[PDB]
Amino acid sequence: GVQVETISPGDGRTFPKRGQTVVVHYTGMLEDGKKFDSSRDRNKPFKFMLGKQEVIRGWEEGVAQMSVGQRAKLTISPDYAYGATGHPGIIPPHATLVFDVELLKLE
Template identity: 35%
Template sequence: MKRRKEKNRSSSKKRTRGNARDTRAESEEFLKKNRLKPNVIETESGLQYSIVDPGEGASPTEWSTVEVNQRILLADGTVIKDTFRTPDTDRFTMEEAIPGLKEGLPLMKEGGRFRFVVPPDLAWGKRGAGDRIGPYATLVFDIRLERVRG
């Protein structure tokens, strides 16, 4: 009986960062499949995006502060953050953004909603971030640009 309980506890543990080799292979496969989807645009750097709603307002510059609602997922669908489910938005300067968002957000206009697939070298690369984003992780951002300042 004790063994069964121990086994159940270990299987319900929170997902961890994983190992670099597995995450890198998963990322490469995900990016390869995603680029074949209709309406996906890929930039020279490897950033992939699709336009859900183009928006009509201002676009951010490298000196702007942006306010966004966003859902951030790993390639396997694990949700890292979701402000769409809260009354709060995220606010940050473009200078603070990861390279993939520094490239992608200026493509947007206020009120617009894009889906960005950010390869590891435009996100946190081989170091990962915290205990949930492993090395070489591809990230998916579903972002609505609520406001641009500056």
Template identity: 45%
Template sequence: MEILQCGNGVDFPKAHDQIKVHYVGKLADGHVFASTRDRNEPYVGILGVGRLIKGWDDVIPKLSLNSKALLTVPPHMAYGSRGFSPVIPPNATLVFEIELLQIN
């Protein structure tokens, strides 16, 4: 994980918290497969209950509110050998620029 912008340093999400993030997801070759910024609609999810990829569940709790980070997620912490057809091939390493906007 590379921190691109420090957050408030106080508020960190934990398991079962609802989070709101903006993200740009890319394959290792730079191809963008998803972007909440392009849709202008942040993603809302629950941390630590198996609804997010493991890479997010493991790293997002280390980010404080308003942080921006660059995450490189290996296949075994993303979609593994099954991929996520048609946008993510099997065994793909994923790169996310993620901004933590809200914790509930």
């Protein structure tokens, strides 16, 4: 599944709703601890629309469990990410992924 742990609290009340655009900063790490992606390098937040399934399942479900302003650690099992095959050259087969995610705004 996806586990969500608070690093810094959000407002506790404003949770993403289906069809809203979710605006975040993130860093993604493998189980070996290595960073494979981050929006922070780009100085431009990442945006996705909740419900479009245009991010992996653990994001669709995990970021929906965050309140605006929260920074959270998401631990995502392979079946909620890239599964048996992974994404060759980037994500190993059957990989658990760890993200540091900050929910900046909803639009």
